[PDB]
Every structure is written in structure tokens, then in C-alpha cells.
Amino acid sequence: QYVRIKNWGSGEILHDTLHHKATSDSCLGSIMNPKSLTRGPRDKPTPLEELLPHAIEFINQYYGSFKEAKIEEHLARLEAVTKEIETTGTYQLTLDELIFATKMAWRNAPRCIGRIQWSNLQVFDARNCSTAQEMFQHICRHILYATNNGNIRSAITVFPQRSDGKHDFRLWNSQLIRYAGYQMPDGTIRGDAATLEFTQLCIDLGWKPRYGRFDVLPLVLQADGQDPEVFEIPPDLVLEVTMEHPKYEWFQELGLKWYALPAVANMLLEVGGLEFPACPFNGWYMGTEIGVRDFCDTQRYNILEEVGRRMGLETHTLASLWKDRAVTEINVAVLHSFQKQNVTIMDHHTASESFMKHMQNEYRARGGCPADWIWLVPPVSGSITPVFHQEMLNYVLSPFYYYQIEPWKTHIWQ
Amino acid sequence: QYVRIKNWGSGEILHDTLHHKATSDSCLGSIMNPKSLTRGPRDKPTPLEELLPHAIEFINQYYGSFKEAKIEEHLARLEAVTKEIETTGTYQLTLDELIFATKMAWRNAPRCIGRIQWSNLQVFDARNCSTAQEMFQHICRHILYATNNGNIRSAITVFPQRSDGKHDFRLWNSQLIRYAGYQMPDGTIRGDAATLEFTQLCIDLGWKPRYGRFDVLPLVLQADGQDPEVFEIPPDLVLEVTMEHPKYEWFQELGLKWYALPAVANMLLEVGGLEFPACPFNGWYMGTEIGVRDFCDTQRYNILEEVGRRMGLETHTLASLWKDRAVTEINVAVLHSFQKQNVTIMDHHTASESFMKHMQNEYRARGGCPADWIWLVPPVSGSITPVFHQEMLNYVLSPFYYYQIEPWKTHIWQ
Ligand code: HEM
Ligand code: HEM
Ligand SMILES: C[C@H](O)[C@H](O)[C@H]1CNc2nc(N)[nH]c(=O)c2N1
Ligand SMILES: C[C@H](O)[C@H](O)[C@H]1CNc2nc(N)[nH]c(=O)c2N1
């Protein structure tokens, strides 16, 4: 009938009607959460006829990897899995297979710039997990390991796969560590405005609202199918960096800081027909994530106004390019503060250059590299970056990290 | 078989093979010159059966415009055109129809941010033109009018439409005014490196190589079907702005400048089945075009290296964000210099805000707005801009400004 279009800044929604008068030649590239990138719920297992080929394909992928293939084991695994599939329905992956799966899924993530590190990933096997509290422990082990007291390490903790579709392990948080956002009495908004709805959710499940600008939200976990059990993260585990500029001593007066761990929580790992709706992973920050998006987005902390004022710029004259000046200084603050406190981070330039190197390796190696330009190009200094001038094809392979429907919309309340 | 992917920075070409292993869910959005945005040559006229409906549709569009429609004239025009179509094959548009066509084609240009000015356009009817020299005169009239001694005016000069396909009027230049690029003896490159091949072409047609950094290229025109006649643009017509920073007095020592007129030459106007392969149009510059792309691209003037050095930044340390600092200063130089010399220009921020306003008007009005995010988001300070957070659908409507195959690849040499 029509296509929905949302503005993530003002949150406004529009309905596109014109597209119908298009030519006999409509890219959805600009869309954030397209259905083609999401993998929703279920009620029944994966039909054998689908599951089987996917499984075989995957096993062919894996065994087709290593130099000098283990043909016998290849055939054996193929045979063993086929058997296991007909006997149980679903099937279990050899640890070394998961490792390969997680790395390939990352390698296949078109919206990630850090993919040159695809082979350096730590996998935590939590497939035998069965309770929320047990998830919580694995997560803490994850956060602890990843943080490594500043020297951030990329890792992913894979929880139990999907069985029937009503026994899903799910983290309700956007990311492992994330600040809270409260709509205060005086009409304002404190904290991360992006985590507004979710915070209310935590509140609704009896969470204690600490009402600040940097209150780390609680881990909302759900095991098997059972309702979400709220767990607060041990503050000793949450490492942070206090923001301070190398020249503007007044910058620390802003009382700004941010967590050192960028760990995605709510994504789904698809591999060989199987799907793990819970498998938080982490890399390390890229300056612009915090400096540009987190701190300067209208929908987030929105600090541009005053960083500009405090810099003495003509904040009431767009043409003065003060926003360009401020943001840059915020970016250095972040980079400086992370560097100073020995917490891993990479600026957007060195990051882009390494990605360009990644593609070169990728194309020469497997002949391609799924890339989402819109996501790969840094939120600032676009063309100054190599990736801006690089043409790319955005396509979904397998294994893959799909988005998924926010669990609180599709959940049972017993 | 495979998809070609080019890096417009290093000029390197890659062949994507992986895309074939895609999912049963490949956006070409990142591609610069896709076939779906181009309108190539011909050998025969437009088959009546195609031409007719398009024509009717267009006339329906036009007459469906004005408040209180001229039904009788609508029917009459429909009837008159149908007749004219069967009698001649092709047909001629009423001036007021072209005006409407050019504005809608602009209104339908998904890669333009200045579309809020869509209704303020000047049309020069050169459909009765028949010789190169005559084109040259119309062009000069265009350049003169558009420039308006700084107070730039948006305008388009429409040359004769397509007849059979071997009698095409074509401007061989990328844009009306454009500097030359020469690959010098000492291995270097002077001028606009982007206009390298074309400059050689001008040279090949006996053009006098003035060997500088800012030598305005000659107008290479072709009428009917006859070969391209080289015409040099009268220097009095070419208005320029000398670059100078409001604080860094050493900036003018760079001896930088740029033309004030951004006029696209090589595009094709499609309307009601008809197609005008020659119809240069112009708006006014947006700072970042010059400051970021023209001056800071590796493939262009590439001035980042020394603007940084002269600023005293740590040019050998990417993490210092010197590139972010330099570019910003170059942007102000441009904006300042244009403002100082009373030459119309708009910064990227005020531009984006006006586009956001444009969409609002557009959606509410006709229910849509073809937009190419990749092109609409400024080459710097992306997320600081509203359009970055705005989801959009990129689709081809009609009328439209298509790209076209560089004429020197597909031309007769008598
Ligand atoms: C090692 C350093 C890494 C860096 C520098 C890096 C950086 C980034 C950046 C800049 C983004 C965009 C974030 C945003 O705008 O929301 C991103 C997205 C993404 N990254 Fe990477 N990443 C890294 C590691 C990883 C790892 C280890 C995985 C998975 C195993 C991964 C998976 C993804 C996925 C799926 C996305 C898309 C997230 C979404 O759609 O919201 N990244 N990454
Ligand atoms: C009045 C002020 C205008 C402004 C500020 C403006 C600005 C821009 C900018 C920033 C671009 C991108 C240029 C590039 O990166 O190469 C662009 C592209 C474009 N503009 Fe607008 N424009 C204006 C007027 C016009 C007019 C008057 C027309 C046509 C009647 C037009 C047609 C287009 C088209 C077709 C493109 C795409 C060019 C291409 O594909 O290479 N623009 N414009
Ligand atoms: C609407 C638009 O697609 C959206 O704001 C984008 C653009 N590109 C992005 N790129 C990255 N890296 N991260 C993002 O959140 C976004 N958001
Ligand atoms: C390869 C990539 O599409 C290309 O470099 C782009 C991106 N977006 C752009 N946007 C604008 N406005 N102008 C451009 O030339 C480009 N080029």
C-alpha cells in the first residue's frame, strides 16, 4: 500500500505514496531496520527440508575451509549431522564449527568497519546454559574478559540455539552496558534519551531508578521461555572513561564519561539453518561512536550546544561552522581520554584505512565483501575517509547476525 | 557473471563474485553511475506505442497541476499531441510545459539537496538552435545570466530534443566551467586531476594548453550530429572567488580560487517520452563541494596535506584528527571567501535544514520525495546534519535528469 519512513532525529513518521509512480528500471538502503535484515519469532521448529540443505551447505563451507581438507571427516560429519537431524530434528555444532560460524557471521556483517579483526575473536560456549542466573554469570564472565582492564578483547558468548521457538534465550537490552534515560519532572530528559522506553521497562520490573546521567542499566534476561529476570551489573565490572580534553581544561567540568565496552546484546546468529537469538558480542569502540553519535545526536546526550558555547563560537550562526569545530574537539576529548586511561579505541581514519585493507584481502580471498556504505562511512569527515570513495555491494550471506523484534513486544506473561 | 566495483579514490577496479551466494531475501545504492540512472544513445526514433502513453501521462501530469484545471484545453492538448505524434512521430512541448518539465525533473532529482528552490528556475528555450556556434552563444547567455555578478541565479538552457538518435546536441564537458588537468613532465599533476582525460581531448582538438592549476577548460560542443567544435569561454564571463581564510592570512598564499558557477553540462532531460541530451542547468554552490570534495579529495586538488602542515598539526599521526581540523578551516575559507566577495553560497548545515523542510512540503504535497541518502548527506559532519537521521527512498520518476554515456566513446568521426 505504502512505505513507512521514519526520521530517527525527531522520531517523526512519514508514509511514502509516490514510489508507486516509479520507473520500469527503489533502494531501501536508507532504512535502518528493514525486514530483510531481521529474523523474527516462531511457534514451530525449522522444517527438516529447509534445515537439512542449510546444514549440509554450512558443513561444506566449514570443511571447504582448512588447507588440505579432512574429506573423510567431512563426509562423516555430513553423514553424522544428517543422522542427528532426522533423529532429533535440530542438530549440534562441534565447538570448532561454532568458532568458525561466529567469525564468518562477523565477517559477513555488512555494517561493521572492524572486520579486519574477524579472525581474532573469543567464543564463550554457553549452549548448555538453562537459567537466567546462569546467563548472568556467563555475561559477567564476558564483560570481565572483554574489558581486560582497558585492553579490550573481542569476544562473543553464544547461548542455547533455537529449539521450537517458544523456548528462546533473550537479552532484552540493546547492548550489555548501556546508560539509563529518564523523562524528568521538569520536562527535561536525563541520561541516554535513547534508552527511555527500556528504562521504564526495567522500572516496571521493580528496578531502582538511580536518576542520573550515567546510570548503567540492569541486565534484563530471559531463559528458555520464562519471563525476564532483572539483574544489576556489578559496578566493579563496568569500566568507564571520564571525558577530558587535552587543552580545554574546562571540558572535564562537563562531567562526561562513557563505558569502555561496546557489546551488542539483542542480535541473532544464524548458521547452517540453526539460529541463536542470544549471543552478545563485542569489539572495541571507534571514536566517532561516542564523540559524534552518543554525545552529539539530538536524540542522545546532545552536548553540541554547550561545547560550542564554552568554546566561544557563534552558536546562533550556522554558517560559522561551529558545529564542525565543536564535534572535532569532542572527538579528540574521547580519543584522548581513552588513550590517557589506556582503554582501547580507534579513530575513524585509521579504522577506515584498515577496512580498505580488509576488502582488498577479502576480495582477493573469497571474491567479495558485503558492505553497507551508509553504515561504514563515519558520521563525520565522510569524504576525507577512503571508504566514502569506495563502491560497495550490500548483501546478506550465511552465517549472519540478524536483528530481531524487540522481545517485549512478542512475549508471554505468566 | 559478476559485478564491477570501482574505488573512485585510487581508481582501482574490483569484481564481486560473492554476491551470488546471497540470501532469498543486494542494494546497488553505493554505485555512482548505475545503468538504472543512465539514458544511452540511439539509432531509431522512439516507437509510437511507447512515446504515446508517456506523452499522454505527461500531459495529464501538467494539466492535473494548476488549481482549477483547463479541462477543455487538457482534452484539446491531449488530442492535439496525439495528432502531432502520429503526423511527425515526435512532438513539441508548449513553453509552459517545458518550464514545468524542467522544474519537475529537478524536483525529481534524488541526488540534489537544493530542491527546495525547485520552483525558482529560469528556462532558456534553445530548441530552435541548429549550430555549434549558436549553442555557444546560448551558453554564454546562460553563464552570464546565472552568474549575475555574484548573485547566482538557477537556470537551465534546453537545447533541441532527440530526433532519430544520430542528430543529438551534446556538450562534451562535465560542467560548463571546469578547470583543466595536465599530467606534467616531472611526474606530478597540475590543475583538476579529475578532468585529465577530457583535457587531453581538448588538446587533441587543437586546444591551447595554458598549463596552470586553474585554467578554465574550453566548451566542446556538438550540434545535430556533426563533430565537436571547440570554443573557448570568454574570461569576462568566468567569475571566480580567490580563497582566503578570515584568520589564517597565510591561506591566500596557497593561491587558491574556484569558479562561482556550478553548472552541470552532460545530463539528459527525459519528459513525456521525449529526451533532451543537452540541457545544462545550474544552481549555486554548497560549501562542502569545493572545500571538501574539490580541494580535499585525493583525486582532485588534494590540499589537505599542506593546509595541515601550515596549521602546525601532527600530519603524521592520524589519531590527532588533524584532517578533521584542516578541512573545517578550508570550509570556512571557502564560505568566507564567497561571502566576502558577495558570491552566493550555502553551508551544508543550513542547506540540510532547508532540505528537511523541503521533504515535509513534498510528502504533505505529493506524498513522497525521491531521495538518495548517499548523495544527500554532506561529505563531512554527517550525523551533525538532520538528513543523516532521515530515512529515504531513492526512486526514478518522470520527468528526470538522467546521466548519459560520455559522448567521445560513442561518436562518429567524419
Ligand atoms: C574489534 C573491533 C570492532 C570495531 C572497531 C567495530 C566497529 C563497529 C562500528 C563502528 C559499528 C557501527 C556501530 C553503530 O553505528 O551502531 C559496528 C557495527 C557492527 N559490528 Fe563491528 N566492530 C568491531 C567488532 C565487532 C565484532 C567483534 C562483531 C561481532 C562478532 C561485530 C559486529 C558488528 C555488527 C553486527 C554490527 C552491526 C550492529 C547493528 O546493526 O546495530 N563488530 N561495528
Ligand atoms: C539552487 C541551488 C542548488 C543547490 C544548493 C544544489 C546542490 C547540489 C549538490 C550539493 C549536489 C551534489 C553535487 C555533487 O556532489 O556532485 C547537487 C546535485 C544535483 N543537482 Fe542540485 N543544487 C541546486 C540546484 C540544482 C538545479 C537548479 C538543478 C537542476 C535544474 C539541480 C540538479 C541536480 C542534479 C541532477 C544533481 C545530480 C548531479 C549528478 O548526478 O552528478 N540542482 N545539487
Ligand atoms: C536513517 C539512517 O540510515 C541512519 O540514521 C543511519 C545511517 N548510517 C549509520 N551508520 C552507522 N554506523 N550507525 C548508524 O546508526 C547509522 N544510522
Ligand atoms: C562511491 C560513492 O558512492 C561515491 O564516492 C559518492 C558518495 N556520495 C556522494 N555524494 C555526493 N553529494 N557527491 C558525490 O560525488 C558522492 N560520491
Side-chain angles (χ1 to χ4, degrees), chain A residues 1-24 26-414, chain B residues 1-24 26-414:
Chain A
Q1 184 190 336
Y2 72 59
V3 183
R4 196 181 202 67
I5 274 178
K6 182 188 179 182
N7 173 273
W8 298 98
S10 61
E12 180 173 271
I13 32 189
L14 290 165
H15 307 137
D16 193 289
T17 297
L18 257 188
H19 62 114
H20 293 129
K21 308 175 190 177
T23 284
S24 312
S26 188
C27 232
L28 290 292
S30 176
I31 302 304
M32 272 246 253
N33 309 303
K35 283 184 180 176
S36 52
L37 240 53
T38 297
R39 186 59 74 92
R42 263 185 186 162
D43 258 354
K44 302 182 174 61
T46 304
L48 284 291
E49 65 276 21
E50 302 184 307
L51 203 169
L52 195 46
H54 291 333
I56 330 289
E57 282 174 58
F58 172 65
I59 297 174
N60 274 268
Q61 189 171 4
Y62 180 99
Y63 279 99
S65 168
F66 217 98
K67 178 198 170 191
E68 49 218 335
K70 309 184 293 178
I71 324 173
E72 31 278 271
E73 299 174 51
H74 183 173
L75 283 32
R77 184 63 178 143
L78 284 167
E79 208 251 82
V81 178
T82 309
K83 182 172 302 172
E84 186 175 345
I85 296 174
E86 39 192 7
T87 328
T88 358
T90 178
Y91 76 111
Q92 291 294 334
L93 290 156
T94 75
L95 181 97
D96 201 356
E97 284 174 343
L98 223 198
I99 288 177
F100 179 85
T102 53
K103 294 176 173 178
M104 289 307 262
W106 177 13
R107 192 177 181 179
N108 297 348
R111 300 179 156 191
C112 173
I113 313 188
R115 307 188 325 230
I116 195 171
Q117 283 278 338
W118 75 277
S119 64
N120 303 121
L121 173 65
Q122 184 58 41
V123 184
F124 289 146
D125 199 338
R127 286 177 298 167
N128 49 42
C129 181
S130 59
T131 39
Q133 193 84 40
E134 224 165 341
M135 277 204 278
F136 184 24
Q137 289 156 26
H138 279 104
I139 288 180
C140 296
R141 163 169 170 63
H142 191 231
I143 298 175
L144 182 72
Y145 171 88
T147 304
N148 196 16
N149 200 222
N151 191 212
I152 303 298
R153 288 179 294 192
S154 290
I156 179 180
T157 177
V158 186
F159 286 79
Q161 58 196 66
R162 190 163 237 150
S163 56
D164 70 302
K166 203 163 182 180
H167 293 348
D168 307 305
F169 283 64
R170 295 284 291 290
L171 295 74
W172 291 29
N173 319 71
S174 356
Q175 48 196 280
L176 258 33
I177 290 118
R178 185 90 191 249
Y179 298 123
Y182 324 92
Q183 176 155 119
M184 291 207 95
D186 46 281
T188 62
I189 294 178
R190 275 176 67 81
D192 192 343
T195 66
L196 257 170
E197 191 173 311
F198 183 82
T199 285
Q200 172 73 7
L201 196 63
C202 291
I203 290 299
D204 292 341
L205 311 189
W207 180 64
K208 308 302 292 181
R210 210 160 54 95
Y211 294 100
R213 295 173 302 150
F214 298 99
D215 299 332
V216 175
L217 286 164
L219 240 37
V220 177
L221 279 35
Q222 72 150 59
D224 245 337
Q226 292 81 208
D227 292 25
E229 288 179 62
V230 189
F231 298 115
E232 184 167 319
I233 311 179
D236 291 300
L237 291 178
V238 182
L239 170 57
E240 307 185 271
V241 172
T242 47
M243 295 312 148
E244 61 178 50
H245 198 291
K247 254 84 178 188
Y248 300 55
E249 288 189 20
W250 57 257
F251 193 80
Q252 66 166 245
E253 292 182 26
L254 282 51
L256 248 37
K257 61 172 177 176
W258 196 264
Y259 42 99
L261 196 60
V264 187
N266 60 189
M267 288 194 115
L268 186 159
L269 167 57
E270 177 282 314
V271 53
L274 306 161
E275 47 184 59
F276 308 75
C279 56
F281 53 83
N282 76 281
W284 50 70
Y285 270 109
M286 180 203 267
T288 56
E289 291 181 71
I290 305 163
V292 195
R293 310 301 263 80
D294 295 332
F295 289 164
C296 300
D297 261 34
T298 300
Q299 64 265 55
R300 310 297 296 294
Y301 286 81
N302 187 26
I303 74 175
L304 250 190
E305 173 85 318
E306 62 174 79
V307 176
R309 276 179 174 170
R310 290 183 172 233
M311 282 182 84
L313 294 345
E314 310 149 66
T315 299
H316 302 282
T317 308
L318 271 304
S320 71
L321 306 201
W322 61 273
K323 299 190 177 181
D324 301 57
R325 291 211 176 105
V327 181
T328 292
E329 300 311 322
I330 299 178
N331 271 317
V332 242
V334 170
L335 263 55
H336 178 239
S337 301
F338 267 74
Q339 207 150 12
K340 187 134 181 172
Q341 306 172 44
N342 285 286
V343 180
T344 308
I345 195 157
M346 181 169 262
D347 61 85
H348 47 314
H349 300 271
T350 48
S352 298
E353 298 189 343
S354 65
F355 179 79
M356 288 290 96
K357 177 64 179 172
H358 177 56
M359 278 192 112
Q360 299 170 26
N361 298 338
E362 208 67 338
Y363 269 70
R364 165 155 193 298
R366 58 191 197 147
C369 184
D372 187 323
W373 192 97
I374 297 194
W375 269 60
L376 299 179
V377 171
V380 293
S381 305
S383 52
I384 306 314
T385 281
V387 317
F388 179 103
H389 310 120
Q390 177 54 79
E391 289 182 324
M392 36 190 77
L393 270 36
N394 180 26
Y395 49 95
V396 177
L397 296 184
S398 190
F400 196 86
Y401 290 118
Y402 287 80
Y403 279 78
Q404 48 188 321
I405 304 174
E406 304 185 303
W408 57 96
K409 292 187 176 301
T410 61
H411 193 65
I412 313 150
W413 277 87
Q414 53 226 256
Chain B
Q1 184 190 336
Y2 72 59
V3 183
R4 196 181 202 67
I5 274 178
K6 182 188 179 182
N7 173 273
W8 298 98
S10 61
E12 180 173 271
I13 32 189
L14 290 165
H15 307 137
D16 193 289
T17 297
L18 257 188
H19 62 114
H20 293 129
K21 308 175 190 177
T23 284
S24 312
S26 188
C27 232
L28 290 292
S30 176
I31 302 304
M32 272 246 253
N33 309 303
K35 283 184 180 176
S36 52
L37 240 53
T38 297
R39 186 59 74 92
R42 263 185 186 162
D43 258 354
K44 302 182 174 61
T46 304
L48 284 291
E49 65 276 21
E50 302 184 307
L51 203 169
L52 195 46
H54 291 333
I56 330 289
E57 282 174 58
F58 172 65
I59 297 174
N60 274 268
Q61 189 171 4
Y62 180 99
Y63 279 99
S65 168
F66 217 98
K67 178 198 170 191
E68 49 218 335
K70 309 184 293 178
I71 324 173
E72 31 278 271
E73 299 174 51
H74 183 173
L75 283 32
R77 184 63 178 143
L78 284 167
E79 208 251 82
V81 178
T82 309
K83 182 172 302 172
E84 186 175 345
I85 296 174
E86 39 192 7
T87 328
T88 358
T90 178
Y91 76 111
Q92 291 294 334
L93 290 156
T94 75
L95 181 97
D96 201 356
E97 284 174 343
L98 223 198
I99 288 177
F100 179 85
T102 53
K103 294 176 173 178
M104 289 307 262
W106 177 13
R107 192 177 181 179
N108 297 348
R111 300 179 156 191
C112 173
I113 313 188
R115 307 188 325 230
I116 195 171
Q117 283 278 338
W118 75 277
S119 64
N120 303 121
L121 173 65
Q122 184 58 41
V123 184
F124 289 146
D125 199 338
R127 286 177 298 167
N128 49 42
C129 181
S130 59
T131 39
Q133 193 84 40
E134 224 165 341
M135 277 204 278
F136 184 24
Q137 289 156 26
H138 279 104
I139 288 180
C140 296
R141 163 169 170 63
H142 191 231
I143 298 175
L144 182 72
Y145 171 88
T147 304
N148 196 16
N149 200 222
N151 191 212
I152 303 298
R153 288 179 294 192
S154 290
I156 179 180
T157 177
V158 186
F159 286 79
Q161 58 196 66
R162 190 163 237 150
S163 56
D164 70 302
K166 203 163 182 180
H167 293 348
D168 307 305
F169 283 64
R170 295 284 291 290
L171 295 74
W172 291 29
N173 319 71
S174 356
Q175 48 196 280
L176 258 33
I177 290 118
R178 185 90 191 249
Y179 298 123
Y182 324 92
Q183 176 155 119
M184 291 207 95
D186 46 281
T188 62
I189 294 178
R190 275 176 67 81
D192 192 343
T195 66
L196 257 170
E197 191 173 311
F198 183 82
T199 285
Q200 172 73 7
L201 196 63
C202 291
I203 290 299
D204 292 341
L205 311 189
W207 180 64
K208 308 302 292 181
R210 210 160 54 95
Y211 294 100
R213 295 173 302 150
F214 298 99
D215 299 332
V216 175
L217 286 164
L219 240 37
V220 177
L221 279 35
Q222 72 150 59
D224 245 337
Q226 292 81 208
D227 292 25
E229 288 179 62
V230 189
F231 298 115
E232 184 167 319
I233 311 179
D236 291 300
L237 291 178
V238 182
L239 170 57
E240 307 185 271
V241 172
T242 47
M243 295 312 148
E244 61 178 50
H245 198 291
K247 254 84 178 188
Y248 300 55
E249 288 189 20
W250 57 257
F251 193 80
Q252 66 166 245
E253 292 182 26
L254 282 51
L256 248 37
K257 61 172 177 176
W258 196 264
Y259 42 99
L261 196 60
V264 187
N266 60 189
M267 288 194 115
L268 186 159
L269 167 57
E270 177 282 314
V271 53
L274 306 161
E275 47 184 59
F276 308 75
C279 56
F281 53 83
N282 76 281
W284 50 70
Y285 270 109
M286 180 203 267
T288 56
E289 291 181 71
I290 305 163
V292 195
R293 310 301 263 80
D294 295 332
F295 289 164
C296 300
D297 261 34
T298 300
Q299 64 265 55
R300 310 297 296 294
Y301 286 81
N302 187 26
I303 74 175
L304 250 190
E305 173 85 318
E306 62 174 79
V307 176
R309 276 179 174 170
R310 290 183 172 233
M311 282 182 84
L313 294 345
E314 310 149 66
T315 299
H316 302 282
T317 308
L318 271 304
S320 71
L321 306 201
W322 61 273
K323 299 190 177 181
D324 301 57
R325 291 211 176 105
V327 181
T328 292
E329 300 311 322
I330 299 178
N331 271 317
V332 242
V334 170
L335 263 55
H336 178 239
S337 301
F338 267 74
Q339 207 150 12
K340 187 134 181 172
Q341 306 172 44
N342 285 286
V343 180
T344 308
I345 195 157
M346 181 169 262
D347 61 85
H348 47 314
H349 300 271
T350 48
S352 298
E353 298 189 343
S354 65
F355 179 79
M356 288 290 96
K357 177 64 179 172
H358 177 56
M359 278 192 112
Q360 299 170 26
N361 298 338
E362 208 67 338
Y363 269 70
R364 165 155 193 298
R366 58 191 197 147
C369 184
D372 187 323
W373 192 97
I374 297 194
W375 269 60
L376 299 179
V377 171
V380 293
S381 305
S383 52
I384 306 314
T385 281
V387 317
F388 179 103
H389 310 120
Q390 177 54 79
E391 289 182 324
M392 36 190 77
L393 270 36
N394 180 26
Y395 49 95
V396 177
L397 296 184
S398 190
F400 196 86
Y401 290 118
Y402 287 80
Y403 279 78
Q404 48 188 321
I405 304 174
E406 304 185 303
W408 57 96
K409 292 187 176 301
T410 61
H411 193 65
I412 313 150
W413 277 87
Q414 53 226 256

